[PDB]
Design a protein around this ligand. Structure first.
Ligand SMILES: *[C@@H]1O[C@H](CO)[C@@H](O[C@@H]2O[C@H](CO)[C@@H](O[C@@H]3O[C@H](CO[C@H]4O[C@H](CO)[C@@H](O)[C@H](O)[C@@H]4O)[C@@H](O[C@H]4O[C@H](CO)[C@@H](O)[C@H](O)[C@@H]4O)[C@H](O)[C@@H]3O)[C@H](O)[C@H]2NC(C)=O)[C@H](O)[C@H]1NC(C)=O
Length: 361
């Protein structure tokens, strides 16, 4: 099985214990670590943070300890606007410029591949994404002739049915990608004025939005569209999502007034790192959505949907049972990488739980 793990370049800036640099990563934890994100400038791949060349080096020094570890560089993300991707991919010339720029940059910086994180292709982009993936793969095939192991090509893909239908030719891109990471953790609609879980494995008992907004639906749909199981990797989050409650009610359908207050370290309303959630749990009441097989917790006027050791193990068993290629974790810097917040004196408790289950049989 693959265990694909993202590290985000902006996590270095977090205050105190929130600060995460690539040398915090256990070299034997994941099979693939993906650094996010690279920029595209002058139609060519490029660095983003002022110190990316240094951090790339810190990440790739992990291979000294684990020579089998593979690293990839992810281009795109939400800061990079999807409009920028569309412009590049939609013209033969700009597409070529971008593709040609990729292998030399990856080789210079010691990466084993490229991950495409276009968030997200629209209806007008579907055919252009197919050509980008096919042509990029063709370039990697050419570059391998020069003697070095062929660069890998992956993509992070929406797990939402509507977004999938709108923007991706799954049958075609699956042929050329070495793996597809499904973003199976963005299932709670931003329009919803009630609490709800963003990463449920199965649908909930009543009033769900779509019997589509769950990981099992997304996995089945991708297989149905022609992605081979051995190309699909199921995403598992190490962050949770938070809401401010609008009333004393906390169970299914509880009204909310907006996102939860920011975490002390991650400082973004509506999201919390797992290490922040571990602390939040002190004094909180814990519940589990039976049917959806994922937990939530609440205290005060705050309500948090999240994944714990039990839920990530459960998802790992699920993806093995569906004979998928493995799991993807977003993100290492949001797990308890220090090992000091979750009361087990264990680094990367969520990611390690997934790893341990993948090894079982
Ligand atoms: C990720 O990559 C993106 C894409 O490359 C980066 O964004 C780019 O950043 C550069 C540098 O800041 C910026 O360049 C700008 O260039 C203009 C000149 O524009 C010319 O063309 C214009 C047509 O639209 C025309 O109107 C103009 O006359 C020019 O001919 C600069 O304009 C000033 O130039 C001088 C010197 O700076 C000034 O003295 C003068 O007063 C002008 O006002 C701008 O100041 C910029 O330098 C790109 O425009 C920008 N591209 C996009 C699409 O956003 C980005 O930095 C990178 N991110 C990270 C995190 O690395």
């Amino acid at each position: 099985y693959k265990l694909i793990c993202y590290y985000t370049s902006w996590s270095q800036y977090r205050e105190g214990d929130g600060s995460c640099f690539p040398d915090a990563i256990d070299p034997f934890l994941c099979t693939h670590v993906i650094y996010t994100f690279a920029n595209i400038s002058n139609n060519e791949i490029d660095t983003w943070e002022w110190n990316d060349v240094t951090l790339y080096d810190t990440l790739n020094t992990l291979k000294n300890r684990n020579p089998k570890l593979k690293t990839l560089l992810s281009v795109g993300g939400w800061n990079f606007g999807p409009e920028r991707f569309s412009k590049i991919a939609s013209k033969t010339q700009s597409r070529r410029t971008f593709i040609k720029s990729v292998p030399p940059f990856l080789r210079t910086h010691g990466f084993d591949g490229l991950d495409l994180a276009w968030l997200y292709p629209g209806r007008r982009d579907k055919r252009h994404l197919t050509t980008l993936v096919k042509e990029m793969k063709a370039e990697f095939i050419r570059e391998a002739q020069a003697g070095t192991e062929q660069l890998l090509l992956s993509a992070a893909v929406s797990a939402g049915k509507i977004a999938i239908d709108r923007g991706y030719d799954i049958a075609q891109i699956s042929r050329h990608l070495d793996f597809i990471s499904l973003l199976t953790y963005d299932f709670h609609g931003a329009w919803r004025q009630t609490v709800g879980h963003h990463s449920p494995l199965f649908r909930g008992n009543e009033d769900a939005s779509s019997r589509f907004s769950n990981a099992d639906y997304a996995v089945s749909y991708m297989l149905r569209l022609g992605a081979p199981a051995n190309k699909l990797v199921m995403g598992i989050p190490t962050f949770g999502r938070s809401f401010t409650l609008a009333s004393s009610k906390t169970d299914v359908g509880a009204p909310v007034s907006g996102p939860g207050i920011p975490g002390r370290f991650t400082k973004e309303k509506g999201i919390l790192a797992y290490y922040e959630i571990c602390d939040f749990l002190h004094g909180a009441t814990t519940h589990r959505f039976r049917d959806q097989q994922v937990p939530y917790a609440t205290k005060g006027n705050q309500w948090v949907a999240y994944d714990d050791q039990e839920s990530v193990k459960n998802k790992a068993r699920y993806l093995k049972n569906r004979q998928l290629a493995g799991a993807m974790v977003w993100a290492l810097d949001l797990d308890d990488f220090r090992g000091t917040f979750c009361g087990q004196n264990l680094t990367f408790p969520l990611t390690s739980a997934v790893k341990d289950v993948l090894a079982e049989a």
